[PDB]
Symmetry: C4
Subunit: 388 residues, 4 copies
């Protein structure tokens, strides 16, 4: 009932423990589960929930044929209980649209969905389950945003949006919202060349976003934001451990303010926790496809351009599919420090498993632990052959 | 916890943004979704919900054969969460009957369903989930009401009812209710010749209803109601832009107090927001069938008998089916002014798509924006051929 | 939050209006609806709900074969929202057992289920969702109770139970409960020869039950109970309009303290509202099967042994099936007087419709009105042939 | 809102009455019910709920093939309403893992799930729906815990865990938790040789657990715990009535501090209420398989090594399958004394019913009564042949 303030710092991460997993494609083989993608996880003061962009069909309905396409009029942002499937009967629709973000400021929740044709799209900002502000396309080519939660400090909650080419210079803006209303906005500044799909967190009154350059970097852009002063800066992560996909093999030396060359015009949403010696990077294991997934401890990855791993943890094995991944935290948990968490989207279907006509996913999520705990891998677990 | 008072005026409408959409016939192909029609949208102080008249079968059950018929003992008024499907397991039954209306007065909700044979029907008025007043048929031929929400001001909530022929003079009455109890009622007065199915809103302590003349006007009747004095008047919308369906082509000059001739004995429930220069009319694009849907800005449409459009927005394209449409607003939203909203019913099945045996629909709804936002079209999206 | 007191008297009943109906066998043809029978309706301070004894299978599951049998280990008392179907996913299990009753005393709800073999059955009394008192069989032959709600006055809520033969003298007792605990009990007294299945209501601090003599009366037993003094008496309804089924045709003169002869060893649960000139009897239309259903106004039916009908209302037509019927009222509704209500069970399947292997039902319920409203009939509405 | 204190003693148990039963495999033949095993029952201050470890598939989905295996990444602890089925749409996931326990301390609920490979497993302790403490494997061979509720006294809630061989000496520890945090822990002490799967209760500020020796006793280990002093002791139940399974026939004299020999390396989770003359033991009827189930009154079973039964009650007959069983009580029920309750898991499928490919179960539970009530048997009730 008063706005949350990013007061604490992050706990030390010595390993990751399972937090939620829904087994959605298994259970969807014989239950009424909706076809999604682009999932994430966000918390309220009293419950943390799973989120995704619906495709408007169940996995076994006939209209599941064709769900590899990203934007259409039948998609919506939906949320559901932690670790249940997106069912037709248990899901809550937040807003209509084929790109989103959402965060709670302590008093209530802001949601933003985007819909439109490519050259005439528009975002409307929902605060306390009601429509308040709308924004229209500025550069007239697929206006999009984070696809994972935003972060708020005393009422102000910044959101990064890109409008323009995904294969050349684009127009990115950081908007500062409070209670649904635009306070100010700025264009992207600093050395990042291209921003797409930011995954963010905050600690000690600062917001950090690890984003995706689609144009030309296989190393990742980072935006640091100040919610009080309402300003931001951008860099690339210095470390040679490259975490975009597809990507060239790891070099010896990395790049701090320029894209690392080697693969152009493609990527994946990813994240990292950047906290000095306590820094952990997430990445696909295949350099060529979204398959496998690992967490790697690389001290001072952001600043040191020769930093190599110090400890690791396999989250998904290379023979299993992964996809998008992002950051969230439960800022309303009791304790001295923010515990860091992430989710990994596990895509099943087209394009890699071409023998069915649909695309869908399941979620796995994890949080940090100060113990050095043992590891297991967490694959989707459906057998595509049962759907034939 | 005290009665709502229509205090504000309407915001300026410079375009319309998506508000809710449920994709019910898509998802019903493989989920347990009920067969409906005659939908609308109404808001409580804490949530806005979708409503419709159930047919008592799911779309894929065998009893869906024959649901083109309008009145029977198996229909009921049901409500469900905003932007979910009318599912068997997520729906709430408000009352039993094949015609309805419903509004919240600030303290609690009044619902009215009607059932009976044609020559002996009856309305019972429910207030706070309990039956309170009943009214019996006065002219003994299909007693009916709005099929969309009523509007309340300080406890009084007026409802328009018609009893009699749909193809000649009928008996229409406006009843003023407070907490379920009839305060007074009047017969229709003013120049409207025939009223059927009113769609209403209020601003600055006045209620406006745009209704359907079935007998002989292709231009629409309007009733202005005063909830304090409890009086009303009626006219037709002056503008030559004709918004009933089927209808003759648009003339040059319009009619203010007489039906515009050209099509007799048929129509569709429709609406409009009548606010001086800030006036917007909704209509089907086909003059011959309920197909396509558009919003048109026609300044002073009610009074000027030569008013032509000034700006437009396509809501459904002409190759896709539409149906009934109406007005609602969220009178409990924060702000200086009432934001105007509407829904469009999208009928699928018989009679136009004769290769299945059922009739059902989905909902699309929209609210206004002061920005000039870009447009997309919003079709039902099912493929009838999957139901064969 | 303090016990309800039967303070008011009954309103005048000049006709009956629809209150709830669920269309369960229609919708069960293609939804996951449970097989029930022996339904009734009971109200809490904030909601009225539907109740029945489950058979532990859905209508279309294979285990629905054999549900004509009455007692087994798989039955339970369940409640669900007013006018929805008993679905697997929307139902609440109150207690386990193949005979029940349930009422709310103002503070919280008492439920009683009975299970056992025929010669060793037992009742356990649940108050505030917890087990409190248990009673064991006294005469060792199918211990049973009302199959419809009990009625409470200032904490005391009496329940009638029969243990023994259904085809000869039995042992009936009236137990007075308060907060789950037996205060006292008495054996049946007065002139009724055999009690089975009582349907009760209260007005002005008196409880009236119309019961079923199975042994030898086609006229019905009535028990009047005093909850303060905790005493009771019994008679038969004097009127020649006979309301049990099967039954001989209506005589000219009736019997006040003896069973009317003509049909032995069979019956149906039924009810009546006994209020001087304002008295209304419910009965099947067939004298030979449970088919058709009507309400009849017979002034002073209880006392006058020559009373004939004065006004009527057809509830179900004779070509459609009916079954059990009973009384409830919403003692927590605002108003000067108790409005009288009833439900009718509509059985579908074996034994009359032998071409399927299951038995199940739907509910229709009605309440009274002081208006003289028009009538419609309310049949189940499923087509058995869709289940083949 | 303040911690529960084990204040009362147990009521006298003169027979057992039905409390809950869900009929899950019957209803799962045609509803979306999840495949489980290892169920139990736990109560909150306001509701008692059913719990089990999910297999991540519905009974009729294809992924049900192979659910005889115990540990995998697709299992989770779920809870659902008392006496409903574990449905996809009505279940709540508590934590991820293939072994668990859970109890409410009066203020809120602690849950512990365990996942991992066999040689690197880990427990994480959830308090108030959030992850708080994690523990890693100490002896590196299937770290497991109770599979039924723990018991709390003024904030401290002890849990027994075993890590190591199931066929030789293992490492067992008793951890004392308060609000999610480890206060202390001890290794097992006293004369018990092997602990696996403890079923516990408390009365007068003492916790009693009846556990399973898998290695070599057909008589059962008992741990008595003191939550204030945080200490414990262990013995075997002295009585010759042997309650593990498989087991040799009952001897004449029993063993108080040594395993009774006769069957090595196998068992079943079971329980008992140990209260002087008021002592009741539960056991399978077959000495060779988990089939049949009975309650037996054996006065002073724990201490007297020649104690024989005095009274009995058949719960499941020998021709029907049983499985695991355990103890719970509703410590928040009104009354002078704790009423004792238990559940029995009823396994259906492989390995005994090899003609299907899945394994699943239903629950039956019972509580005590001071009346001598009559008995019935409570079998699962599905017919396997309907699943072919
Ligand atoms: C029980 O549970 C515990 C807890 O999980 C288990 O213990 C963990 O075991 C993990 C696996 O062994 C281990 O993870 C690794 O940690 C390494 C850190 O070790 C180094 O430092 C420590 C301390 O200083 C030393 O002891 C040790 O000797 C090392 O010096 C990481 O280096 C490991 O990551 C790399 O290996 C894996 C494959 O094995 C790669 O997938 C990964 O990407 C890393 O290697 C690639 O990238 C680097 C960096 O640029 C390159 O140098 C390297 O050549 C690889 O590059 C190619 O591949 C990538 C990806 O395909 C591609 O992009 C690139 O182009 C190249 O093609 C690893 O993360 C945990 O630290 C350990 N935890 C703890 C606390 O012990 C235990 O085993 C369990 N089991 C049992 C049986 O009990
Ligand atoms: C990006 O997004 C933006 C936002 O949506 C898009 O911009 C919008 O584009 C819309 C389509 O062009 C446009 O809508 C039209 O607005 C007209 C107003 O324009 C006039 O005034 C402005 C300013 O004064 C001038 O600039 C302009 O030159 C005009 O003078 C309306 O007139 C349009 O409606 C009519 O056209 C459509 C078909 O195009 C008809 O369906 C509709 O019914 C209207 O026409 C019929 O009715 C009139 C009135 O009686 C008749 O005169 C006419 O002949 C037609 O009559 C026949 O048809 C009807 C229906 O079948 C039948 O009943 C009758 O009998 C006859 O048979 C239209 O509404 C928006 O204004 C514009 N918005 C803004 C802010 O710009 C942009 O394009 C998007 N795209 C891209 C690529 O970026
Ligand atoms: C619009 O809506 C309104 C509101 O519903 C409709 O108006 C209602 O219409 C009803 C049907 O006509 C009517 O109901 C009947 O009321 C009779 C009362 O009428 C008498 O009194 C009034 C005033 O004093 C007089 O005007 C009138 O002339 C009469 O004197 C009841 O008598 C009727 O019930 C009997 O008839 C039906 C069949 O028609 C039987 O099923 C029923 O059981 C009753 O008859 C049997 O039982 C009696 C009593 O023992 C016997 O005497 C008789 O012979 C029958 O016995 C056989 O059958 C039974 C059952 O099978 C069996 O057990 C026995 O053994 C024998 O075999 C009836 O109830 C409403 O009163 C009326 N309401 C109002 C306010 O007007 C209107 O019509 C609608 N329609 C339209 C088109 O607008
Ligand atoms: C109506 O409802 C009421 C309420 O339920 C019903 O009344 C109950 O009826 C029950 C069944 O008769 C009865 O239960 C039995 O109680 C015995 C106690 O009786 C003794 O004491 C009383 C009073 O002192 C005396 O009246 C009586 O004469 C006796 O002396 C228990 O002994 C019974 O348990 C044993 O029998 C059953 C089979 O019948 C076994 O399954 C069970 O395991 C017990 O026997 C085995 O174990 C013992 C102990 O070591 C051995 O000595 C014995 O030989 C058996 O051993 C073999 O089998 C086991 C299991 O397979 C195996 O492990 C071992 O190796 C050996 O192979 C039984 O529990 C209730 O007490 C009674 N309740 C009341 C209040 O009356 C009434 O009947 C219902 N019916 C009707 C029609 O109205
Ligand atoms: C956050 O800080 C503001 C002042 O900046 C204060 O009013 C607010 O209550 C603080 N938040 C919380 C959760 O205390
Ligand atoms: C899916 O659609 C394609 C064309 O878009 C069609 O050929 C294909 O057969 C469909 N798949 C199935 C399984 O119906
Ligand atoms: C509406 O007006 C009445 C007086 O006409 C007042 O009592 C009521 O509280 C007002 N409504 C609200 C929501 O304040
Ligand atoms: C629907 O009913 C008609 C007659 O009312 C029948 O001929 C038709 O075949 C039915 N449709 C289907 C698909 O069963
Ligand atoms: C019912 O009567 C008792 C006294 O007999 C009184 O305490 C109670 O509050 C009354 N009930 C209500 C609902 O007022
Ligand atoms: C129902 O059970 C009977 C015997 O109890 C069997 O003959 C019959 O065929 C079954 N019905 C169906 C449709 O399976
Ligand atoms: C339990 O005991 C503590 C003191 O040991 C006390 O504070 C607490 O309130 C007691 N529990 C309850 C439910 O009263
Ligand atoms: C289950 O899996 C086995 C091998 O694991 C396969 O042979 C069997 O046929 C499957 N069962 C069914 C009914 O599909
Ligand atoms: Ca890239
Ligand atoms: Ca018309
Ligand atoms: Ca009889
Ligand atoms: Ca053993």
């Amino acid at each position: 009932r008063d706005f949350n303030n990013l007061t604490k710092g992050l706990c030390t991460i010595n390993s990751w423990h399972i937090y939620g997993k829904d087994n959605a494609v298994r259970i969807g083989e014989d239950s009424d589960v909706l076809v999604t993608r682009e999932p994430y996880v966000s918390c309220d003061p009293d419950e943390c929930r799973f989120y995704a962009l619906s495709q408007g069909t169940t996995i076994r309905g006939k209209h599941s044929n064709g769900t590899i396409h990203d934007r259409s009029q039948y998609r919506a942002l939906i949320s559901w209980p932690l670790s249940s499937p997106p069912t037709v009967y248990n899901s809550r629709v937040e807003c209509i649209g084929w790109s989103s973000t959402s965060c709670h400021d302590g008093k209530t929740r802001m949601s933003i969905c985007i819909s439109g044709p490519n050259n005439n799209a528009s975002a409307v900002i929902w605060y306390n389950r009601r429509p308040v502000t709308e924004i229209n396309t500025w550069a007239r080519n697929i206006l999009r945003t984070q696809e994972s939660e935003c972060v708020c400090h005393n009422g102000v909650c910044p959101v990064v949006f890109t409008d323009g080419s995904a294969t050349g210079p684009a127009e990115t803006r950081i908007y500062y919202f409070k209670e649904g209303k635009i306070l100010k906005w700025e264009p992207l500044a600093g050395t990042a060349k291209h921003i797409e799909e930011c995954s963010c967190y905050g600690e000690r009154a600062e917001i950090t976003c690890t984003c995706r350059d689609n144009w030309q970097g296989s190393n990742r852009p980072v935006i640091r934001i100040d919610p009080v002063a309402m300003t931001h800066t951008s860099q690339y992560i210095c470390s040679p451990v490259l975490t975009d996909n597809p990507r060239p093999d790891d070099p010896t030396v990395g790049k701090c303010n320029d894209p690392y060359p080697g693969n152009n015009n493609n990527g994946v949403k990813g994240f990292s926790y950047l906290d000095g010696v306590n820094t952990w990077l997430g990445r696909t294991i295949s350099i060529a496809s979204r398959s496998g997934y690992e967490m790697l401890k690389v001290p001072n990855a952001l600043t040191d351009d020769k930093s190599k791993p110090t400890q690791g943890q396999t989250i998904v094995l290379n023979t299993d599919w992964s996809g998008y991944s992002g950051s969230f935290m439960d800022y309303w948990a009791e304790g001295e420090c923010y515990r860091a968490c992430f989710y990994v989207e596990l895509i099943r279907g087209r394009p890699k498993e071409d023998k069915v006509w649909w695309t869908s996913n399941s979620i796995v999520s994890m949080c940090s632990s100060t113990e050095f705990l043992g590891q297991w891998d967490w694959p989707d677990g459906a057998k595509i052959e049962y759907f034939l």
